RNA sequence: UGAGGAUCACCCA
RNA sequence: UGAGGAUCACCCA
RNA sequence: UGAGGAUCACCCA
RNA sequence: UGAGGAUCACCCA
């Protein structure tokens, strides 16, 4: 059994879907990368640690590239013009049962659901108003 | 027009749904809180700032309480036994168009989609394996 | 295959069986915990290392909790009254064949079989005599 | 009771089973060995002591011979290439009743039961994957 | 995908082929071993890491047993007289696409193809002349 | 004989095959380069040395360039945008027979055969999982 | 290595 | 800890 | 010796 | 910056 598998990061119908596959699990930090040039790839990392006596803490990171070609002196390379960096930390007390954690997960999916305030603000280069 | 409205943070079918409503927008930090005792309420905040010359940065926070009653000296109060703290920061270059931002949003929804590695690890009090 | 699967740690004859499932493989330590809050879960860990040029060493640990509900600060928390710890290390020479290794597994199974001296002493808060 | 008795360590289904018999009781440490030279013998020892004010601890040790290509009664050097050593330590809080102790024994029987991850890994000269 | 699977390491044309199977995944380093004692086993391990800012590096190691005059399941010392070690390091710039990577794999397949200089020298216990 | 001959390093099915030819043996390092300017050529080197009293070590290196044309000082020069480097060392005991050595060659050929885990990961900018 | 300890992937000698 | 920064498992207070 | 590094017959620890 | 902590728009390096 494993949850260290590939998954669809960006679902674009069933085509142009961005799939991220396992790449490295060194030092408790799991990493997933999309295919083709590592320079234009999406990246996801995740780790868990006991942050304190009562807390466990997850550190998730995501990088979404702006795929581009760089031309210098006539030599062109596949690059990412830029990248967005998502950094999230989730602190969960050791008293949380499985039920409690499932609720925490729903809260996270609800926050980002289409039409809700936050994903709407981001998707439109906006803030709250 | 406004995106500073109430929304369903936790969708539990159509009942037992947790709804978070606008509460305060002081200093560029929008806040949403669920109803009833502020002590047992869910909380969501969000703000955007130009973190640097080329970047705009969102700071989103969520608190999911473990609803409980505290009894001290026979006097009982509605409290949260504990809370999970989600803290996320999203950095987006000013070169991102609306299309680019929509993709960033899909990447975030995909990361947390049911069945994918991360939401599965959290929901089960686990790490990656 | 993938031997990293769930199993029933305590067999209470199909009813109240304690099954344990894969939950982390960070740092090369396979972990399995029961479906509980991390404060009340059974935990099993295993790691193998080439301890010497000519040996391999398996380190296995099991934690069996005595679950309770404790009132802290007027609030009830799921807790473990106490925990019992099993720590085992098994050193096997690199010259051991798979059949030599199956011999070690059977010896460990016979050692703890119901009715034999050791599991009888333990279950009765007794020594060998 | 009087549990210090001979028992079947390796059950090969009646034919070629390995029986281990009491061989020493110096200092309260019970010892059992198979009918072999001490260099090629199966050996089991067991002792209990109150490790600290809140715990009792069982120290169980098992030595298993490398059987493939073994010369019965011969001088096989180095000793370390021809022997596997198992060392178990069971720490049990003084509050554990006979029932609590019976469950701990079941947890140990389950951990090593045939077909489960740990015994499968060992028998196949493997780790977890 | 999910490439962590059993494969034929030495193809002797169906009869007496050596198959190597997954045996460890501690730390993200995939391991595969043949069905032998660890002293006589065929072993393969593989890992990837971003070596520096511009490169990714694959570390592949293979251990091959000295088979002539081998005693199956026996204790053969010194270990160094009975084993060959292959250590490969593949450094790939982050700009390499899947296509670039496919060509690199072909360069490796050609270098070792039957009848070419390098494999002929090795197989004949020779150098270049 | 004289195993110092040319061979096709990259087999693109008779059309666009990259063949490499003997080009230097100075200092006991056999070298082979493709028909290009030295700035754009593929390069393969091999040397064998009695690394210890009881071993022999082959050091093999392959360089696969990504060719480009670069404008330096207003003038175009044939250049390599980047290079991928393979470095392999193979240590073989002096006790290895020619058939023991043919076993090592086949193992290396099986390891990289199309379809097997390792060449599949590399070609897909993926790790093993 | 220890019938050393633990609050158990930590500490001791 | 931080609506602290980042070129993102770095760095700052 | 190193799942140490490289601009790759060089450098590091 | 930090797989730095938090009682979470705080605090640390």
Query: Closest Cα of chain F to A75: distance in Å?
Result: 6
Chain A residue numbers with beta carbons less than 8 Å from the beta carbon of F81 are 75-77
Q: List, as own/partner pairs, every contact residues D26-30 make where C-beta atoms lie below 8 angstroms and the sequence separation is at least 24, other chains included.
A: D28/C127, D30/C117, D30/C128, D30/C129, D30/D4
SS3 label, residue C99: helix
Please tell me whether any atom of strand H lies within 7 Å of the Cβ of A19.
no
Please tell me whether any atom of strand I lies within 7 Å of the Cβ of E47.
yes
Which of B70, B71, B125 is closest, CB to CB, to C23?
B125
C-alpha distances (whole Å) from C50 to each of A89, B98, C92, E47, E117 are: 35, 54, 10, 18, 36
Element (DSSP H or E) covering residue B123: helix B117-123
According to DSSP, the residues that pair with A33 across neighbouring strands are: A21, A43
Chain E residue numbers with beta carbons less than 8 Å from the beta carbon of C56 are 38
The burial of D66, by beta-carbon neighbours within 10 Å (0-12 exposed, 13-18 middle, 19 or more buried), is given as buried
Residue D44 to residue C69: CA distance in whole angstroms: 40
Asked if C69 and C78 touch (Cβ cutoff 8 Å), the reply is yes
C-alpha distances (whole Å) from E126 to each of E81, E119, F2, F92, F97 are: 18, 10, 11, 12, 12
Please tell me whether any atom of strand H lies within 7 Å of the Cβ of B23.
no
Residue A51 to residue F19: CA distance in whole angstroms: 57
Among chain A residues, CA nearest to F74: A73
Residue E25 to residue E4: CA distance in whole angstroms: 9
SS3 label, residue D102: helix
The DSSP string of D49-88 is: E--SSSEEEEEEEEEEE--TT--TT---SSGGGSEEEEEE
* Terminal C-alpha separation, chain D: 44
Asked if A127 and B48 touch (Cβ cutoff 8 Å), the reply is yes
Asked if B97 and B115 touch (Cβ cutoff 8 Å), the reply is no
Going by C-alpha positions, the residue among F21, A121, E76, A90 that lies closest to residue B28 is A121
Among chain A residues, CA nearest to B48: A127
A114 touches chain B (CB under 8 A): yes
The structure tokens listed for C30 are 């396979």
Residue A88 to residue A73: CA distance in whole angstroms: 39
The structure tokens listed for A4 are 């260290």
- Name the experiment that determined this structure: X-ray
Asked if B59 and A57 touch (Cβ cutoff 8 Å), the reply is no
Query: Closest Cα of chain F to E74: distance in Å?
Result: 17
Residue D82 to residue D63: CA distance in whole angstroms: 10
C-alpha distances (whole Å) from C37 to each of A90, A99, B42, B123, E111 are: 16, 9, 21, 11, 55
We report the CATH number of the domain holding residue A59 as 3.30.380.10
Residue C60 to residue B51: CA distance in whole angstroms: 48
Element (DSSP H or E) covering residue A53: none
C18 touches chain E (CB under 8 A): no
SS3 label, residue B54: coil
Q: Which nucleotide's C1' is closest to D58 (Cα)?
A: G3
Residue F93 to residue F56: CA distance in whole angstroms: 6
Chain C and chain D touch, per 3+ beta carbon pairs within 8 A: yes
Asked if C92 and C104 touch (Cβ cutoff 8 Å), the reply is yes
The structure tokens listed for C15 are 């009813």
SS3 label, residue E28: helix
Cite the beta strand spans of A2-127 per DSSP E. Answer: 7-10, 18-24, 30-34, 43-50, 55-72, 75-93
**DSSP code of residue E27:** G
C-alpha distances (whole Å) from F8 to each of A24, E78, E98 are: 33, 39, 22
* Terminal C-alpha separation, chain A: 46
E53 touches chain F (CB under 8 A): no
C-alpha distances (whole Å) from F94 to each of E85, F54, F91 are: 13, 5, 10
Name residue, tokens 């061989």: D23
Among chain D residues, CA nearest to C3: D117
Residue C19 to residue C9: CA distance in whole angstroms: 5
Count of structural domains, chain D: 1
Q: Which domain holds residue C64?
A: 1-129
The structure tokens listed for D79 are 């000793």
Q: Which backbone phi and psi does F40 adopt, to 5 degrees?
A: -120, 5
The shares of helix, strand and coil residues in chain D, as percent rounded to the nearest 5, are 20, 35, 45
Q: Which nucleotide's C1' is closest to A50 (Cα)?
A: J3
Please tell me whether any atom of strand I lies within 7 Å of the Cβ of E54.
yes
E15 touches chain C (CB under 8 A): no
Asked if F35 and F21 touch (Cβ cutoff 8 Å), the reply is yes
According to DSSP, the residues that pair with F68 across neighbouring strands are: F79
Q: Which of chain E's residues 23-42 bind strand I, using a 7 Å CB cutoff?
A: 29
E23 touches chain D (CB under 8 A): yes
Chain D residue numbers with beta carbons less than 8 Å from the beta carbon of C51 are none
Instruction: Count the Cβ atoms, other than its own, within 10 Å of residue A75.
Output: 17
Among chain D residues, CA nearest to E76: D81
Going by C-alpha positions, the residue among D90, D86, D126, D123 that lies closest to residue D108 is D90
Going by C-alpha positions, the residue among C99, E123, B90, B128 that lies closest to residue A111 is B90
């Amino acid at each position: 059994a494993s949850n260290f598998t590939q998954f669809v990061l960006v679902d674009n119908g069933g085509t142009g879907d961005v799939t991220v596959a396992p790449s490295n699990f060194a030092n408790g930090v799991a990493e997933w990368i999309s295919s083709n040039s590592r320079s234009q790839a999406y990246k996801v990392t995740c780790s868990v640690r006991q942050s304190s006596a009562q807390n466990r803490k997850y550190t998730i990171k995501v990088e979404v590239p702006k795929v581009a070609t760089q031309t210098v002196g006539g030599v062109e390379l596949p690059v990412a013009a830029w990248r967005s960096y998502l950094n999230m930390e989730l602190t969960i007390p050791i008293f949380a049962t499985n039920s409690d954690c499932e609720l925490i997960v729903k809260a996270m999916q609800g926050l980002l659901k289409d039409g809700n305030p936050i994903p709407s603000a981001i998707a439109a280069n906006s803030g709250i108003y």
